[PDB]
Design a protein around this ligand. Structure first.
Ligand SMILES: CCCCCCCCCCCCCCCCCC(=O)OC[C@H](CO[C@@H]1O[C@H](CO[C@H]2O[C@H](CO)[C@H](O)[C@H](O)[C@H]2O)[C@H](O)[C@H](O)[C@H]1O)OC(=O)CCCCCCCCCCCCCCCCC
Ligand code: CLA
Ligand code: CLA
Ligand code: CLA
Ligand code: CLA
Ligand code: CLA
Ligand SMILES: CCCCCCCCCCCCCCCC(=O)OC[C@H](COP(=O)(O)OC[C@@H](O)CO)OC(=O)CCCCCCCCCCCCCCC
Ligand SMILES: CC1=C(/C=C/C(C)=C/C=C/C(C)=C/C=C/C=C(C)/C=C/C=C(C)/C=C/C2=C(C)CCCC2(C)C)C(C)(C)CCC1
Ligand SMILES: CC1=C(/C=C/C(C)=C/C=C/C(C)=C/C=C/C=C(C)/C=C/C=C(C)/C=C/C2=C(C)CCCC2(C)C)C(C)(C)CCC1
Ligand SMILES: CC1=C(/C=C/C(C)=C/C=C/C(C)=C/C=C/C=C(C)/C=C/C=C(C)/C=C/C2=C(C)CCCC2(C)C)C(C)(C)CCC1
Ligand SMILES: CC1=C(/C=C/C(C)=C/C=C/C(C)=C/C=C/C=C(C)/C=C/C=C(C)/C=C/C2=C(C)CCCC2(C)C)C(C)(C)CCC1
Ligand SMILES: CCCCCCCCCCCCO[C@@H]1O[C@H](CO)[C@@H](O[C@H]2O[C@H](CO)[C@@H](O)[C@H](O)[C@H]2O)[C@H](O)[C@H]1O
Ligand SMILES: [Cl-]
Ligand SMILES: [Fe+2]
Lengths: 29, 341, 34, 29, 37, 323, 76, 35, 61, 437
């Protein structure tokens, strides 16, 4: 039915963290 | 009714984002300025105008990307995409710095649109338009720095580029070439900004620490009701505290909030006046009496003379790469050094 | 009940579609041999 | 390398996995 | 490096010091699960 | 007895200026620092801030105006040594080596710490919540960073900020030369703190001024619409919130006055905390980001960025401020 | 119309699990093909300089700057 | 120099002792609420 | 015994993952908690034994 | 029970303040946090060990925890050379396993354990206003801390010793046989000026004084623990302090802030308990080593000496601000009047020259993206000294803990007096006062 809002928030945060970490990894490479 | 009244009714409907008549100017121009900055810092080089890499595609990071100014040989050309420099070629337009003038002009008209939006919403809601009056100071700063200052100088090249490290270069350029810290209008601007930050912190802390107990919760935020008529904090206690701590205190809340309006707006306006002066190289570079004294007396040394030496070093060591159109070749012997004096 | 395509939708998508396009472009830049 | 990313993704799922399991089981979360 | 028998656990050791920070994040996840009540 | 009457007077809320115990430390130290600062700024002799016996004249009587005048920091030969008047052979030697700077900064730092304590003390005596002193801890940390912590890290009070206007500008330029503070994220957080503090100050002032409830006529100032100690609020926060919610979107606008004023306190205080910590960490030579030669082409040639222009300017400052 | 009420629905995530990866891949292919270099005129890492000479191709004319850029691009 | 040192030491000691014994003299009771 | 010690360490890692992900979800869900308690007791004893075994097998490699 | 705003009065962002009058859950939070600390110790040790090259110096590899183990003499030999790396592994593994145990206990007491301990026990159940119980717990913890200090003493005197950088030849692991138990020297360190050339307790320059001071501090902590177990606070102490949990927290916050500042200055200046073989040279050490190396070169070809404010022969130039530096590679060459020119011409050893060159190269100068050299350097070397990282991090932590001390001390006073939630509208204290003018 409805996805819980905290699940959406957590996965969006993890995607944001992965994107930022990829940018820093490229900054070191 | 007529088509104008129907359009006016639709433009001023309550929605999530208010549009208004001013939205027609604001939203396209603000969108284009922001999107042009993102596009330039992601993809567009500064190799042919500055000899610099300034995009993510070239390997720069968030601090070092910039939409750089056009080359000095462009003069003050508007650099329209259909203009005689680009001639409709989008790629050449990007290589020649046309995105800088794109962002600057669309940002200027977007700032106009935002101030008109402030007026329009103040008129519809029913409040006085003091927010637009306060927004006149960032507009004055933007116009003086990004438009009036390069128009006074030789070209758009000496305007600030839209980037973090480019703005830092602009700061250091103004120190080295203009002695901008010595300018009294910049001093009034610094006083306005720092006093505004002080007033912000001190008013927030004073209100937070003179609150009335309006609930039994230890976290006091929920004890405020937006529709209540009583003030949420004690002005008498705050006045007493600052009278006994500092000597003086606000006793009129309206004068306090007008003063919070007044201080940073006046500071930014004074700094804009100083930048207008710097557009014509009307600097506060030196004190004539101190220069005469230093010329007569070789042992006379103040912090002002040391700052002049630092400015000379900045100019000579940054000019060949910061102004590559001039083809400055400074041999190592003419470069100022501390062990050479 | 609630409509789909409003002014809020246009504002969100004009900010969000090029954001995802640019993020993909910037990641592909992260995997470029310097 | 793939092993380090796999392990950190495994742990960073394992935390929210505890939260999700406790939310499903209706515990004292 | 590590002792030579402890050789296939190098990625795990590489991600070990990160873990306490996640605990802080975990609190917010838990607080998001209960709606920050 | 005498001590009880003295204690009742010291902690009295009926004094025009509150003293308190923090005040019995604060008043003599700040008075000493003020008197010594005025005398040094007017009439101090030149100070050999280096050891090369080439003194820097900072007072008004020796050829400075208000802008160029300063109290010169103590000598590099002193270093971090405690240099009171009695540790010099003569008063002229104490003045020559920059002893007034040490006296002024030590009394000032002590007095300003006790100013923070006195703010807490009066808030306690008036039944207030106590956290105005926490907000004051951000400029106090900045003063400690530029007067004490940076000299400790660099190993000499000659590297403290001079007590003047042009001396302050010299401190800024040399700091950028040696540490690249503009590229330090803590200083960037500080700039965000002060620019945002000015923005939010102008914003809150303009929004409260915009929504003032009509109590007067056009022939009188609107400030007379407010009376000191009135129970009712002088402006309509609902109207201001409706305006600001329509200006951006509804959920970017505070509807809670207490949350709004906490944000007003919190933003510049945290920003100035971080910039004070930035000065304090560059004291131990943990400098700003160094992006020199970060773009290389296929043939190995360096492609300059804006950071390399900043580096050239920093090199120009660095070769000038030495020797 | 509430943002939480739509991002917590399933239809939103079906539509955007389709659309968001396609836009990400489109940006990825915009860079990884090299079309971005051609569109915005950004030099490739081997085309900053000529074969041997190390001169930055600054433009020095206003009305023939396009020809100066074309002349430099014709040298590599 | 030394008489100045003794004078400064006496004054500093006097004010520091004032501070310490003043905050020892029932300071939490000196508030308009409880005690 | 390189193969035995590596297997013991892998079992220690897997059991530590089970205990990390399973002890709080049993402590905070008190329904039918006797079985959960005996499972936690067995897991803790096996974890202590695995730590001791990994230490001595490290000494025996 | 008390896990929301309505029941507790605290929001989610102050939700740990819901633990104040809940002794079992508070104990769970503390034990779980201690598990976090031990976990970081073990995991960071294993991380540093995994990338550790024992041949290269530690300070070139971004290490802060392995130098702490090496300073205790575990795994090191003469000159700071690593002769074994297994003790680092043991320290990391034992910390990791103990952190698993502490995490189990913290999770148990936070979730499954009793919410309050006053029903289950009288020994562990406490009230914040119970001054005798608070002093009893303080006494227990004082005895534990004294035992820890004596554990350091036992490591120094009976189990291998400590790494002495002041040992002749270039430092070695030495057993401390004669600790300085004379209270005159120890409390002279306590009474020394913190300014330049004196430096307070940061200026301790031999391990005999370190071990003697730790014997004194262990005996003092044990005696104070016994004193607080067997006594109750006096009238002046009851009248002086606020007796509540937030007040005790604020007292500890002020103490920790002071300790953080002291540790910052200790790791920045002291090269005895932070040997330069492991942490790298100090700033003064690197500057003086540059002056020494330049003097040696220029003599190998009088240009680097001056006469100091007090008459000693010191190095010249900007390094004259660092003339109070003392180092093991330099003190053989310092005579009664300072640096003797004859000792630097015909009495120097190769190890001192090698130390001086290595320390000249690795000055504590770096950038936030870990690039060495001055701010105007190309991105050539990837090195920031561990001294810089430790000093900067602990200054930041010490300042924020001073801020937290101010916050919690003010809130404890306001809450004890009863106006922490705001001003009572019905009786505002300023309104009953007469006007100032
Ligand atoms: C209740 C609190 C009471 C406080 C109220 C006021 C009472 C007096 C307090 C004085 C405060 C300290 C200021 C002076 C510290 C300084 O200049 O000196 C720091 C000294 C370091 O001393 C150095 O110590 C060195 C010791 O090394 C020597 O010995 C070593 C032995 O290995 C080596 O051989 C080495 O080479 C050799 O030189 C040298 O002697 C140096 O010359 C000497 O400068 O540290 C030390 O003594 C210890 C560290 C002191 C703390 C440092 C300041 C931090 C404060 C932060 C303020 C923030 C406030 C925020 C408000 C919001
Ligand atoms: C709010 C809307 C708005 C506004 C105010 C502007 C404003 C501007 N844009 Mg712009 N733009 C917009 C939206 C807007 N834009 C949108 C939505 C796009 C994307 C499609 C663009 C894309 C764009 C590009 C690509 C460029 C600009 C540029 C410019 C600048 C110069 C424009 C110029 O010289 O033409 C002025 C033209 C008019 C004012 C039209 C007046 C119409 C008259 C009054 C009616 C009568 C005309 C008549 C019927 C026609 C007869 C013609 C016949 C004789 C042949 C100017 C600041 C240029 C720039 O920034 O240079 C650096 C540029 O190159 N714009
Ligand atoms: C060091 C960090 C730390 C620690 C130890 C605690 C500890 C605690 N908090 Mg807390 N908190 C923290 C940070 C921390 N907090 C932060 C950063 C915030 C801000 C978001 C909060 C906000 C907050 C609120 C708002 C509340 C608490 C409460 C509590 C207490 C009860 C929690 C509970 O019942 O869990 C319930 C949650 C669960 C059962 C979910 C599972 C969580 C488990 C423990 C995860 C364990 C993971 C770990 C890897 C397992 C290892 C086990 C293995 C060793 C065998 C507990 C003592 C509550 C309280 O005071 O109670 C009266 C309360 O209302 N906290
Ligand atoms: C041993 C130290 C210690 C202890 C036990 C406490 C305990 C407490 N504090 Mg306190 N505090 C401390 C140090 C400490 N503090 C310090 C050093 C400061 C200064 C910054 C403060 C400032 C402070 C304030 C301003 C307040 C408290 C409050 C509280 C109470 C509730 C805390 C809570 O739920 O937080 C929940 C935890 C969070 C919301 C987490 C916040 C996240 C932090 C700020 C960012 C961390 C960044 C990290 C270090 C690095 C980046 C990580 C990366 C992921 C980005 C509780 C009694 C509250 C109170 O008075 O209640 C009575 C309150 O309002 N504290
Ligand atoms: C700060 C530390 C601390 C404190 C004060 C307590 C306090 C308590 N625990 Mg607890 N516990 C802790 C840590 C702590 N625990 C840890 C780390 C674990 C995981 C192993 C546990 C696991 C645990 C369980 C599973 C239970 C308790 C229970 C109890 C309660 C009764 C204890 C009793 O009767 O034992 C009497 C005293 C002893 C048996 C003596 C124990 C001596 C130990 C084993 C040796 C210690 C050596 C040395 C001093 C410690 C050095 C550690 C150092 C490295 C830090 C009491 C409130 C019980 C409870 O609440 O029931 C309702 C219960 O069932 N605890
Ligand atoms: C963690 C350590 C700790 C803590 C928190 C306490 C806490 C306490 N002790 Mg205590 N104590 C300890 C360790 C500790 N003790 C140890 C190890 C010993 C053995 C030596 C003692 C011996 C002891 C005795 C004999 C007495 C106490 C007392 C007290 C109580 C009053 C504290 C007070 O007003 O002192 C604050 C200190 C002062 C008011 C003295 C003036 C300090 C000046 C102003 C500051 C100077 C320091 C300055 C910052 C510079 C630092 C370095 C300097 C020395 C050069 C309080 C409950 C008293 C009590 O009530 O007994 C039950 C008491 O008479 N303690
Ligand atoms: C660091 C501390 C964070 C700012 C809080 C203190 C600011 C000082 C302002 C002067 C006093 C202002 C003043 O009087 O404030 C008072 C204000 C309201 O007081 P209350 O009494 O209602 O609540 C505080 C306690 O009594 C517990 O309820 O306190 C708060 O809102 C505390 C917020 C805690 C926040 C917890 C951690 C969140 C940190 C957010 C920032 C971190 C990210 C940084 C990004 C780079
Ligand atoms: C110029 C031009 C144009 C235009 C275009 C446009 C309009 C575009 C747009 C564009 C866009 C519109 C883009 C976007 C982008 C974005 C991005 C790229 C983003 C990123 C992000 C990130 C990175 C994130 C961040 C964050 C934040 C901010 C906060 C928190 C943290 C984080 C980090 C998460 C046209 C053709 C018309 C015309 C011609 C010219
Ligand atoms: C030693 C080791 C181990 C252990 C481990 C552990 C102990 C773990 C834990 C872990 C954990 C404990 C984890 C956690 C995680 C978490 C996460 C990953 C989270 C995140 C978060 C986020 C993403 C957020 C979001 C949000 C919210 C929710 C709200 C607001 C908004 C935001 C966005 C902020 C093992 C067994 C493996 C094995 C052996 C080794
Ligand atoms: C209360 C609570 C909390 C917290 C919690 C905590 C904080 C906990 C802790 C916990 C902990 C603290 C844990 C720990 C764990 C650990 C473990 C489980 C470990 C394991 C390990 C192992 C298994 C090892 C292995 C090895 C070896 C033996 C050698 C070398 C290699 C390797 C590494 C593989 C929170 C905030 C969330 C929320 C609210 C509630
Ligand atoms: C190990 C060692 C050592 C030794 C050490 C020692 C022996 C220490 C001790 C120390 C000590 C023995 C310390 C003490 C401290 C103290 C303090 C820190 C105090 C505080 C106080 C207070 C806080 C008070 C307050 C008050 C007042 C002011 C008034 C009234 C109110 C009240 C109560 C609040 C040495 C260096 C030789 C060497 C190296 C190693
Ligand atoms: C270290 C040990 C120091 C203990 C001495 C200080 O202890 C404290 O001293 C002051 C004056 O000195 C005494 O006297 C005090 O009485 C009350 C305190 O409630 C005050 O109103 C009064 O002004 C003051 O004279 C206190 O009754 C005693 O508690
Ligand atoms: Cl200079
Ligand atoms: Fe206000």
């Amino acid at each position: 039915g409805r996805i819980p809002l905290w699940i959406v928030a957590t996965v969006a945060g993890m995607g944001v963290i992965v994107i930022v970490g990829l940018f820093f990894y490229g900054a070191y490479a | 009714r007529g088509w104008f009244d129907i359009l006016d009714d639709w433009l001023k409907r309550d929605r999530f984002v208010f549009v208004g008549w001013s939205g027609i100017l604001l939203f396209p121009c603000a969108y284009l300025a922001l999107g042009g900055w993102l596009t330039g810092t992601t993809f567009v080089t500064s190799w042919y105008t500055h000899g610099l890499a300034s995009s993510y595609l070239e390997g720069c990071n968030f601090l070092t990307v910039a939409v750089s100014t056009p080359a000095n040989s462009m003069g003050h050309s508007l650099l329209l995409l259909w203009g005689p420099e680009a001639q409709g070629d989008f790629t050449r337009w990007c290589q020649l710095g046309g995105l800088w003038t794109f962002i600057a002009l669309h940002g200027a008209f977007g700032l106009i649109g935002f101030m008109l939006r402030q007026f329009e919403i103040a008129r519809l809601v029913g409040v006085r338009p003091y927010n637009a009056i306060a927004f006149s100071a960032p507009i004055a700063v933007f116009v003086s720095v990004f438009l009036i200052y390069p128009l006074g100088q030789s070209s758009w090249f000496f305007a600030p580029s839209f980037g973090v490290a480019a703005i830092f270069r602009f700061l250091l350029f103004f120190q080295g070439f203009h002695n901008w810290t010595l300018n009294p209008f910049h001093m009034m601007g610094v006083a306005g900004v720092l006093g505004g930050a002080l007033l912000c912190a001190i008013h927030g802390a004073t209100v937070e620490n003179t609150l009335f107990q309006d609930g039994e919760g230890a976290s006091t935020f929920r004890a405020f009701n937006p529709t209540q008529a009583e003030e949420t904090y004690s002005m008498v206690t705050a006045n007493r505290f600052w009278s006994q701590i500092f000597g003086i205190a606000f006793s009129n809340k309206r004068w306090l909030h007008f003063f919070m309006l007044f201080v940073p707006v006046t500071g930014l306006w004074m700094s804009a006046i100083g930048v207008v002066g710097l557009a014509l190289n009307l600097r506060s570079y030196d004190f004539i009496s101190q220069e005469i004294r230093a010329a007569e007396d070789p042992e006379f040394e103040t912090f002002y003379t040391k700052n002049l030496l630092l400015n000379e070093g900045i100019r000579a060591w940054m000019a060949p790469q910061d102004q590559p159109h001039e083809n400055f070749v400074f041999p190592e012997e003419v470069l100022p050094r501390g062990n050479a004096l | 009940s609630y409509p789909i395509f409003t002014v809020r939708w246009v504002a969100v998508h004009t900010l969000a579609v090029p954001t995802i396009f640019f993020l993909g472009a910037i990641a592909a830049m992260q995997f470029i041999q310097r | 390398v793939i092993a380090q990313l796999t392990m950190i993704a495994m742990i960073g799922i394992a935390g929210p996995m505890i939260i999700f399991l406790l939310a499903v089981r209706r515990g004292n979360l | 490096k590590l002792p030579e028998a402890y050789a296939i656990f190098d990625p795990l050791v590489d991600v070990l010091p990160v873990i306490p920070v996640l605990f802080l994040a975990l609190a917010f996840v838990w607080q998001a699960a209960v709606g920050f009540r | 007895n005498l001590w009880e009457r003295f204690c009742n007077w010291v902690t009295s809320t009926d004094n025009r200026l509150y003293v308190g115990w923090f005040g019995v430390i604060m008043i003599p130290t700040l008075l000493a620092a003020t008197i010594c600062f005025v005398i040094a700024f007017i009439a101090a002799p030149p100070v050999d801030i280096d050891g090369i016996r080439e003194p820097v004249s900072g007072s008004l009587l020796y050829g400075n105006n208000i802008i160029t005048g300063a109290v010169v920091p103590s000598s590099n030969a002193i270093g971090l040594h405690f240099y009171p008047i009695w540790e010099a052979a003569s008063l002229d030697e104490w003045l020559y080596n920059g002893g007034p700077y040490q006296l002024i900064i030590f009394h000032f730092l002590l007095g300003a710490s006790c100013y923070m304590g006195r703010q807490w003390e009066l808030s306690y005596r008036l039944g207030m919540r106590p956290w105005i002193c926490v907000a004051y801890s951000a400029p106090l940390a900045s003063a400690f960073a530029v007067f004490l912590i940076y000299p400790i890290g660099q190993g000499s009070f000659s590297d403290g900020m001079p007590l003047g206007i042009s001396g302050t500008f010299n401190f800024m330029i040399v700091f950028q030369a040696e540490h690249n503070i503009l590229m330090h994220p803590f200083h960037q957080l500080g700039v965000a703190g002060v620019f945002g503090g000015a923005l939010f100050c102008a914003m809150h002032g303009s929004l409260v001024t915009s929504s003032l409830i009509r109590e007067t006529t056009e022939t009188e100032s609107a400030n007379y619409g407010y009376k000191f100690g009135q129970e009712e609020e002088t402006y309509n926060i609902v109207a201001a919130h409706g305006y600001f919610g329509r200006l951006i979107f509804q959920y970017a606008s505070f509807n809670n006055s207490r949350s709004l004023h906490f944000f007003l306190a919190a933003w510049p205080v945290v920003g100035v905390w971080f910039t004070a910590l930035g000065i304090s960490t560059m004291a131990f030579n943990l400098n700003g980001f160094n992006f020199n030669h970060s773009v290389i082409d296929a043939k190995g040639n360096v492609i300059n960025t804006w950071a390399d222009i900043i580096n050239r300017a920093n090199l120009g400052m660095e070769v000038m401020h030495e020797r | 119309r509430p943002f939480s009420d739509i991002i917590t629905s399933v239809r939103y995530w079906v539509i955007h699990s389709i659309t968001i990866p396609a836009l990400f891949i489109a940006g990825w292919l915009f860079v990884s093909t090299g079309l971005a270099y051609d569109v915005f005129g950004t030099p490739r890492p081997d085309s900053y300089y000529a074969q041997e000479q190390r001169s930055i191709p600054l433009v020095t004319d206003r009305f023939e700057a396009k020809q100066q850029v074309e002349t430099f691009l014709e040298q590599l | 120099m030394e008489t100045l040192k003794i004078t400064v030491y006496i004054v500093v000691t006097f004010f520091v002792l004032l501070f310490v014994f003043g905050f020892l003299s029932g300071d939490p009771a000196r508030n308009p609420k409880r005690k | 015994m390189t193969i035995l010690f590596q297997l013991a360490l892998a079992a220690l890692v897997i059991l530590s993952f089970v205990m990390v992900i399973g002890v709080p979800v049993a402590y905070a869900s008190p329904q039918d908690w006797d079985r959960s308690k005996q499972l936690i007791f067995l897991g803790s004893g096996l974890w202590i034994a695995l730590v001791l075994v990994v230490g001595v097998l490290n000494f025996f490699v | 029970t008390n896990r929301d705003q309505e029941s507790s009065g605290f929001a989610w962002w102050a939700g740990n303040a819901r633990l104040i009058n809940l002794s079992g859950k508070l104990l769970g939070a503390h034990v779980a946090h201690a598990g976090l600390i031990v976990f970081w110790a073990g995991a960071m040790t294993l991380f540093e060990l995994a990338h550790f090259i024992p041949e290269k110096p530690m300070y070139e590899q971004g290490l802060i925890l392995i130098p702490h183990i090496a300073t205790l003499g575990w795994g090191v030999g003469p000159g700071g050379e690593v002769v074994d790396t297994f003790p680092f592994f043991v320290v990391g593994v034992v910390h990791l396993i103990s952190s698993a145990v502490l995490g189990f206990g913290g999770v148990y007491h936070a979730i499954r354990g009793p919410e309050t301990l006053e029903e289950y026990s009288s020994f562990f159940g406490y009230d914040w206003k119970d001054k005798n119980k608070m002093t009893t717990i303080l006494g227990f913890h004082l005895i534990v801390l004294g035992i820890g200090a004596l554990l350091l003493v036992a490591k120094a005197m009976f189990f291998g010793g400590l790494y002495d950088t002041w040992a002749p030849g270039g430092g070695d692991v030495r057993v401390i046989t004669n600790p300085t138990l004379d209270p005159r020297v120890i409390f002279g360190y306590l009474l020394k000026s913190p300014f330049g050339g004196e430096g307070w307790i940061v200026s301790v320059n031999n391990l005999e004084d370190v071990v003697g001071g730790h014997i004194w501090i262990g005996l003092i902590c044990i005696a104070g623990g016994i004193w607080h177990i067997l006594t109750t606070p006096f009238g002046w102490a009851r009248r002086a302090f606020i007796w509540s949990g937030e007040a005790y927290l604020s007292y500890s916050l002020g103490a920790l802030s002071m300790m953080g500042f002291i540790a910052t200055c200790f790791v920045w200046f002291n090269n005895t308990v932070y040997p330069s073989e492991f942490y790298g040279p100090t700033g003064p050490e690197a500057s003086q080593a540059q002056a020494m190396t330049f003097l040696i070169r220029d003599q190998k070809l009088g240009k680097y000496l001056m006469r100091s404010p007090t008459g000693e022969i010191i190095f010249g130039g900007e390094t004259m601000r660092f003339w109070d530096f003392r180092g093991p590679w330099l003190e053989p060459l310092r005579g009664p009047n300072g640096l003797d020119l004859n000792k630097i011409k015909n009495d120097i050893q190769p190890w001192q020259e090698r130390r001086a060159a290595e320390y000249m190269t690795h000055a504590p100068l770096g950038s936030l993206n870990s690039v060495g050299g001055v701010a105007t350097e190309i991105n050539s070397v990837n090195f920031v000294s561990p001294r810089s990282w430790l000093a900067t991090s602990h200054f930041v932590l010490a300042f924020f803990f001073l801020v937290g001390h101010l916050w919690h001390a003010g809130r404890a006073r306001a809450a004890a007096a009863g106006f922490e939630k705001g001003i009572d509208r019905e009786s505002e204290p300023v309104l009953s006062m007469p006007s100032l003018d």
